[PDB]
Design a binder for this molecule. Structure first.
Ligand code: 8CE
Ligand code: NAG
Ligand code: NAG
Ligand code: NAG
Ligand code: MG
Ligand code: RB
Ligand code: RB
Lengths: 260, 987
């Protein structure tokens, strides 16, 4: 096409042009990454309500479906192992960088008091569940036919879910009212509450050694050999638990079939 | 078939061949039998026009072929993906479905845009069946011309249309108009004797579409329908296959460029996909992704409406085109080949000059009476105007007072009709004027007497005497003239005048003009009292010693506006050539009267007659003009043709066959020129179709010429071709303005995808979102560039070279794609990362984060601030970076449309707001841009959500940067034509 001497001079122009534009980009991102505050999000326009997760997080298609056979240890060995390797950070040996929280209300830190200008973070260890901690039962109730399902919310910077009382999880079926009683669960801690001194979250940089509060739902009433669907709603004022475009907005639903 | 020997037979042989009678005609039974055998005496129309298949063609083309291929790739990508496990997203289906949708909607658009063009020309056609006076079983009756069968006995009169191909048996001075078959504007004489062997030239054959001008004749039909001389020409014309228009050629050029780029990017980005650890199936999917991205979803629609507007501009001037592609051809055209009789000339015998008071006065030969008339003041003029008004038997038809005099239909001979329209213009109410002087005697034109004469009683009784008027051949009326009117007296016709009269006679004869002599004499009221019984057999009135009145000359003159339109095209750099079948001398006469041959240019035959040298010695290169008659062209060779074709630039072809017109166009197209031909008759229809564009007269045009044409001049205003090129030249420049606009946007939508592949960041842009840009938000601004006024004096530039000057080229595409789309890509990324960081995601976090982003199982993914987002919540963040990349395009596009307003001049020079329509298109680019964002519910109907007002302003600096950058580029090139800047930075 072009002459072999202008081929390079034409080439330098494109290179000289690209480097100019790419340089302006680098000048814009660096200003951009200096425009923001390291400890707080700027807008967070889609986190109007928090999301809820679940363990063991096992899906088929269409979301979480969990079916296991109590007599066969291989159908639930990997369920507890995910629970065990999940809680490896919920042990005192790994949760040292956090403090003995007993305030029982919002933990409003106005100043940063910790090594390297860090902040104080609460503690939540596995023993908070008393039957779903892995001791005495490392099967987390699966072998008994009463499996524990730990429930925990997403962390949002400076979000407050209410002054009135502790937000409590409330698990139950999608009503199958007449044939069979409603689901009976024992939650740990009792009443299925999250302590209010775990709020608000201030950021992974503000609290490098923070961890979420948890509650477990030891399912006791579920019949065996039946496909059942359980929904675990969070009940508080500043939480919406039903958004059609996000089925994990303040709620978790999952399929469970315990077979013997 | 049968005519080659028809005219050379004795009548006894013909009434055997056709089992008829030369004096009594066919039997009614046999004439009915022959009709079934040979079919109606009419012309087969194009009999292959199903209504549903004309739709099918509209779906083909350079863009359509690319559009179909891109659509097909989407499905075989969707199937390849659906097998590999993607969950119920149909952007493959939306994209491919919408891809064919424009190809259909544009196809319907064009189908109607030609169905109306073909229907309005049909509104202009005379639709009454022509009649034919036939003789069968010795009964002369009239029937429709279509019912004639081979061998019939027919008859003709003045004003009769010739019903079929007829062999002459008897003809009393019948002359006919062969202007449709030949270029001959001089009325041809028909005689029952074999003039020639070739039936085209012999006088004993009347042709199918021709017009009998005067006289009367009888003869047998030799061939009917498609078998006539006319039918074979149309059969030839149909056999001609027309070339593809240059505009379609140019678009087929850049689709070859788009695919050349598309497969390069796809392949080179596919071979890196495997190198980052992608599945052979999936990586091939991305390659298919890239090629689908490279096709402009809205380009085909934008182009057709750019051409739809200029067809509106031409149809506004009674210049109707059949297909939108031809709307642009004239601006590109480099050579025009124009039929003479009917196209250049009016094909209407008109009075051109007169001799009286020893002076030749030039009459106004225009049809709108826009030229110059002559000195209408002399006493001799009033006498001469009287004799031509009175000694004339022609008559206007009933109720024609509104239509202009030149276009009026007159019952009369060829010359009598012209002399009538003359007097009706100069005097007004000529036939009412001449009825004030009653007739008492007459002798029509006769061979033995050689003249026509009539004696009239005067207007008022105060003059009881009589007036004798005569007209005829100038030399045969002078022998009977004893005196001549000059300057208010009547002088004896001494030897001074006879030598001065014949010089004028031979002066106007050299022009190829028909000239008639006029004379008069006042009969004494004492020798000839009121009521005198004039006897014609024994001529008891003076047939001699008349007083010569004057000379009136007539010719087939040019049309009014053509003599200047030809000048305006040759100033535009277009090589104009005449191709006609009329005799050379009449051809070169008009060739000079209109401007084909310049003032002071001579053929080689004119140098030998000036230097008094034999033509052999005359140097060839010294001749600007040259005429090649048909006989002299056959013995030539295509290498000879090109030699003389571009040795004498002012070229003329005379006595050419319809094929000899076709070969010339081919020899011109084979030399690289794109040729336009203008014509009216069937002898042009073959050459009309092969031409890159064919202009046909809306009124004078024959059906074959009209049907085989690409453009129709409804009012026959030849001066609508000059405006045809500027609108063609404008759109060519206005397209590569508008085309480059919608091509630049392609890079910014692709680049986020191919970094989302290489870098694995969250999907910056949506597939449906690029559709609202390609098909909704940027079509309206894109078409506004068709309203850009000429940057240069577009009518003075040479016709574009078909090879170098192109709609798009490497300097154009490479600049638009890889320099402005590059700047646009950075506006997207800049506005992408801010929407990420300002919402929680740092730049260096997004790198390689995509696999977690699209994972339906990760419902607590940690952002750079540690916060945990559910899949739907971060999906909205993806929908957000969709619409911030989307708006980042638009703000740069409002600066892209303005910078495409001009290609060379600065926007400050012509002004920002020249285009009222461009700004009213830009306002609606942002109005629905603000609607798709802030409309409630669209977050889920589409992938658009209301962004806050901070991110609107982020890409605005880029839009001003592209304003200045090309401003500098355009401003730099215009001020200084750099020997590096003009060739590269100019598109
Ligand atoms: C949208 O969510 C699902 C992913 O959609 C894919 C997709 C997404 C974004 N894109 C952008 C910004 C461009 C320029 N292209 C694409 C594109 N193209 C994919 C394709 C499909 C069919 C043929 C070729 C490519 C398509 O599946
Ligand atoms: C933290 O404080 C609680 C309340 O007094 C107590 O039960 C627990 O043992 C304390 N833990 C440590 C490590 O001191
Ligand atoms: C919880 O643990 C206590 C102590 O071992 C036991 O008494 C109680 O039954 C357990 N609860 C359930 C629901 O098993
Ligand atoms: C559970 O496992 C045991 C042993 O593998 C088997 O016998 C039993 O049928 C299983 N239950 C069901 C419902 O299949
Ligand atoms: Mg003609
Ligand atoms: Rb595209
Ligand atoms: Rb054509």
């Amino acid at each position: 096409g072009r002459t072999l001497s202008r081929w390079v001079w034409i080439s330098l122009y494109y290179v000289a042009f690209y480097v100019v534009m790419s340089g302006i980009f680098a000048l814009c991102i660096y200003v951009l990454m200096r425009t923001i505050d390291p400890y707080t999000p700027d807008y967070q326009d889609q986190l109007k309500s928090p999301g809820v997760t679940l363990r063991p997080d096992v899906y088929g298609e269409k979301g979480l479906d969990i079916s296991y056979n109590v007599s066969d240890s291989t159908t639930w060995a990997g369920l507890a192992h995910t629970l065990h390797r999940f809680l490896a950070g919920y042990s005192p040996a790994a949760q040292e960088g956090s403090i003995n929280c007993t305030s029982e209300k919002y933990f409003f830190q106005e100043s940063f008091l910790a090594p390297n200008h860090t902040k104080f973070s609460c503690k939540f260890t596995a023993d908070m569940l008393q039957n779903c901690s892995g001791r005495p039962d490392p099967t987390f109730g699966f072998a008994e036919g009463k499996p524990c399902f730990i429930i925990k919310m997403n962390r949002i910077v400076k979000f407050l879910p209410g002054n009135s009382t502790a937000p409590r999880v409330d698990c139950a079926f999608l009503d199958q009212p007449r044939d069979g009683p409603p689901l009976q669960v024992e939650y740990f801690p009792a009443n299925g509450t999250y302590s209010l001194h775990y709020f608000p979250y201030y950021g992974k940089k503000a609290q490098p050694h923070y961890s979420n509060p948890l509650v477990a739902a030891k399912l006791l009433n579920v019949p065996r050999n039946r496909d059942v669907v359980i929904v675990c709603k969070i009940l508080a004022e500043h939480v919406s638990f039903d958004n059609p475009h996000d089925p994990y907005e303040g709620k978790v639903e999952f399929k469970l079939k315990i077979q013997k | 078939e049968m005519e080659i020997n028809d005219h050379q037979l004795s009548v006894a042989e013909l009434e055997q061949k056709y089992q008829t009678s030369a004096t009594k005609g066919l039997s009614a039974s046999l004439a009915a039998e022959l009709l079934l055998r040979d079919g109606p005496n009419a012309l087969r129309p194009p009999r292959g026009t199903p209504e549903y298949v004309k739709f099918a063609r509209q779906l083909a083309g350079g863009l359509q072929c690319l559009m179909w291929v891109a659509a097909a790739i989407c499905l075989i990508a969707f199937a390849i993906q659906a097998s590999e496990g993607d969950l119920t997203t149909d952007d493959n289906l939306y994209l491919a479905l919408a891809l064919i949708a424009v190809v259909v909607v544009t196809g319907c658009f064009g189908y109607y845009q030609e169905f109306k063009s073909t229907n309005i020309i049909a509104s202009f056609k005379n639709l009454v069946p022509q009649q034919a006076t036939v003789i069968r079983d010795g009964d002369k009756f009239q029937i429709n011309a279509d019912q004639l069968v081979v061998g019939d006995l027919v008859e003709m009169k003045g004003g009769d249309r010739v019903p079929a191909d007829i062999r002459i048996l008897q003809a009393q001075g019948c002359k006919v108009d062969n202007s449709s078959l030949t270029g001959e504007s001089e009325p041809q004489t028909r005689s029952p004797e074999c003039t020639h062997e070739s039936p085209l030239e012999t006088r004993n054959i009347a042709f199918f579409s021709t017009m009998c001008l005067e006289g009367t004749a009888q003869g047998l039909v030799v061939n009917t329908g498609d078998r006539t001389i006319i039918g074979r020409i149309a059969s030839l014309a149909s056999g001609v296959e027309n070339e593809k228009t240059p505009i379609a050629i140019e678009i087929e050029h850049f689709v070859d460029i788009i695919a050349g780029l598309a497969i390069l990017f796809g392949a080179t980005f596919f071979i890196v996909a495997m190198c980052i650890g992608y599945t052979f199936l999936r990586a091939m999917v991305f390659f298919m992704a890239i090629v689908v991205a490279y096709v402009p979803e809205g380009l085909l629609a934008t182009v057709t409406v750019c051409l739809s507007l200029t067809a509106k501009r031409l149809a506004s001037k009674n210049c109707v085109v059949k297909n939108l592609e031809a709307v642009e051809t004239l601006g590109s055209t480099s050579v025009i080949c124009s039929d003479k009789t009917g196209t250049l000339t009016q094909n209407r015998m008109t009075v051109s000059h007169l001799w009286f008071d020893n002076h030749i006065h030039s009459a106004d030969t225009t049809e709108d009476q826009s030229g110059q008339t002559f000195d209408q003041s002399s006493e001799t003029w009033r006498a001469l105007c009287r004799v031509l008004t009175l000694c004339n038997r022609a008559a206007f038809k009933s109720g024609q007072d509104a239509v202009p005099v030149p276009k009026r239909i007159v019952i009369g001979d060829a010359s009598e009709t012209a002399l009538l329209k003359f007097s009706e213009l100069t005097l007004g109410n000529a036939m009412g004027y001449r009825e004030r002087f009653p007739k008492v005697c007459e002798i029509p034109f006769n061979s033995t007497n050689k003249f026509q004469l009539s004696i009239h009683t005067l207007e008022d009784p105060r003059d009881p005497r009589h007036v004798l008027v005569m007209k005829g051949a100038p030399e045969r009326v002078l022998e009977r003239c004893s005196s001549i009117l000059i300057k208010g007296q009547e002088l004896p016709l001494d030897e001074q005048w006879r030598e001065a009269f014949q010089t004028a006679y031979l002066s106007l004869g050299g022009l190829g003009e028909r000239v008639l002599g006029f004379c008069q004499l006042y009969l004494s009221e004492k020798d000839y009292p009121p009521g005198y019984a004039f006897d014609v057999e024994a001529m008891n009135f003076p047939t001699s010693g008349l007083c010569f009145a004057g000379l009136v000359s007539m010719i087939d003159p040019p049309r009014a506006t053509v003599p200047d339109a030809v000048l305006k095209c040759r100033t535009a750099g277009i090589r104009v050539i005449m191709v006609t079948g009329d005799h050379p001398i009449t051809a070169k006469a008009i060739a000079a009267s209109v401007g084909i041959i310049s003032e002071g240019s001579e053929t080689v035959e004119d140098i030998a007659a000036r230097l008094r040298v034999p033509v052999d010695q005359v140097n060839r290169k010294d001749a600007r003009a040259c005429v090649i008659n048909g006989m002299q062209l056959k013995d030539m060779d295509p290498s000879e043709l090109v030699e003389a074709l571009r040795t004498h630039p002012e070229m003329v072809f005379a006595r050419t066959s319809p094929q000899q017109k076709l070969v010339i166009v081919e020899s011109c197209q084979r030399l690289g020129a794109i040729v336009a031909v203008t014509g009216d008759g069937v002898n042009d229809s073959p050459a009309l179709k092969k031409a890159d564009i064919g202009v046909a007269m809306g009124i004078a045009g024959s059906d074959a010429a009209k049907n085989a044409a690409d453009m129709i001049l409804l009012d026959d205003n030849f001066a609508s071709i000059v405006t045809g090129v500027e609108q063609g030249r404008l759109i060519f420049d206005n397209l590569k303005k508008s085309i480059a606009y919608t091509l630049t946007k392609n890079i910014p939508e692709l680049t986020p995808y191919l970094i989302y592949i290489t870098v694995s960041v969250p999907l910056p842009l949506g597939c449906i979102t690029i559709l609202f840009i390609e098909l909704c938000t940027d079509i309206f601004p894109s078409v506004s560039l068709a309203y850009e006024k000429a940057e240069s004096d577009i009518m003075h530039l040479r016709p574009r070279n078909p090879k170098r000057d192109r709609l798009v080229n490497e300097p154009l595409a490479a600049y638009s794609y890889f320099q402005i789309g590059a700047i646009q890509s950075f506006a997207g990324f800049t506005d992408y990362f801010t929407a990420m960081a300002q919402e929680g995601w740092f730049p260096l976090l997004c790198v390689g984060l995509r696999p977690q982003w699209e994972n339906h199982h990760l419902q607590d993914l940690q952002d750079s601030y540690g916060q945990e987002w559910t899949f739907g919540q971060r999906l909205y963040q993806q929908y957000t970076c969709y619409t911030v990349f989307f708006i980042s395009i638009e703000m740069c596009q409002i600066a892209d449309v303005l910078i495409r307003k001009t290609r060379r001049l600065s926007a400050f020079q012509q002004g920002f707001f020249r285009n009222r329509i461009l700004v009213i298109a830009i306002v609606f680019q942002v109005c629905i841009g603000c609607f798709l964002c802030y409309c409630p519910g669209m977050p889920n109907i589409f992938n658009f959500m209301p962004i806050r007002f901070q991110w609107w302003l982020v890409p605005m600096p880029f839009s001003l940067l592209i304003f200045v950058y090309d401003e500098i580029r355009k401003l730099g090139v215009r001020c200084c034509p750099g020997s590096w800047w003009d060739q590269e930075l100019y598109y």
